[PDB]
């Protein structure tokens, strides 16, 4: 890959790290809950999988005394992560450029 | 510290204002709307939130007498904060001109 | 003002057009689709809106047979615009070059 | 005519690739998981569709056994096939340039 492209790689792999703390917050941020849902270890992984995308499409959610924020302060770190990479995109199209000779 | 990297902390904070402007507007905007089911002040900012990031991921969502112009608000106010920052993100690739010079 | 914040300005009416457009052909995509739940015209009108910046919360589903293409092309049509105005969004860091002339 | 859009287009022809390999990964994916939603075949396109365009609306929802990561796939699929758009779209303030030139 190229060095900007590491960059944004690089990026990718800090998310995944969030991911295990999200599956973990989850299973406290929700044993206590008014009207909980999530529940388990096993399946909270799975949880964490549909957010950091910056796609909530539902199943399970944190509640209130959960501190909401759970989900919230997962999001995000996905939100920066994916806003990163845009270091390599600006770059795409000055490539336009390079193939102009073959540089 | 830089230039652009303090204007994007400037545009976080106007999001945060947009969020505590929504939650007074939300609830007397649903006080009389059918089905409603946001309601109160404390978790009426809970709802705003989510409907900032546009995910919603699935707590609750206002209905059409509250005036749906109040989420849509929201939602996009949210979007252009994130879009904003982008004067940070699109230097970026620019920093790899002066690293090439070393100074 | 700059040249492409005219520009962006101009897309962002070209999403409110399909709206207009979306909400007419919901109305019958859904009124006599099976599964329907759309229907009334001045219900139709507010779906037309969130669903353009994305969210998913149009507070409504389509099925298959109104044409799942009428959700799915407001839906890109808001990306385009969106996606559109990033024009603007880069010659932001660009107006730093200035700044560092006092030009 | 434009080397950045015949680069951009194609992007989204593989994306339709993915929708139709995914598609028939997701029903027999979902075919086996307990509490299994996305049990159509020919209506799996159409879920494909809104996940790849990341908002899933409110339709359907993978489960677990489903392999999740088949739903994340579409998902990561589109994210990186329009951000690769970004080529062409961050090159249009730079046709300032020419704009300015007039020629």
Same mark, same amino acid.
């Given at each position: 890959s ?10 990718? &792999?800090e998310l995944?790290? *969030? ?5 973990k917050? +989850? *299973? %406290? @941020?929700?044993?206590? @809950?008014?009207?909980a ?12 999988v549909?957010? +950091?995308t910056?796609? $909530? ?8 005394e %959960? $501190?909401r924020?759970?989900? &919230?302060?997962?999001?995000k @770190?996905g939100? &920066? *992560?994916?806003?990163?990479?845009? +270091?390599?995109?600006?770059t ?9 000779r $073959?540089?």
């Amino acid at each position: 890959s190229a060095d900007h492209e590491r960059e944004a790689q690089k990026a990718e &792999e800090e998310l995944q790290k *969030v991911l295990e703390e999200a599956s973990k917050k +989850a *299973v %406290e @941020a929700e044993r206590g @809950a008014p009207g909980a849902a999530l529940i388990s270890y096993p399946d909270a992984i799975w949880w964490s999988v549909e957010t +950091a995308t910056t796609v $909530g499409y539902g199943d399970r959610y944190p509640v209130t005394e %959960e $501190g909401r924020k759970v989900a &919230e302060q997962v999001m995000k @770190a996905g939100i &920066e *992560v994916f806003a990163l990479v845009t +270091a390599a995109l600006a770059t795409d199209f000055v490539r336009r450029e390079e193939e102009r000779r $073959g540089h």
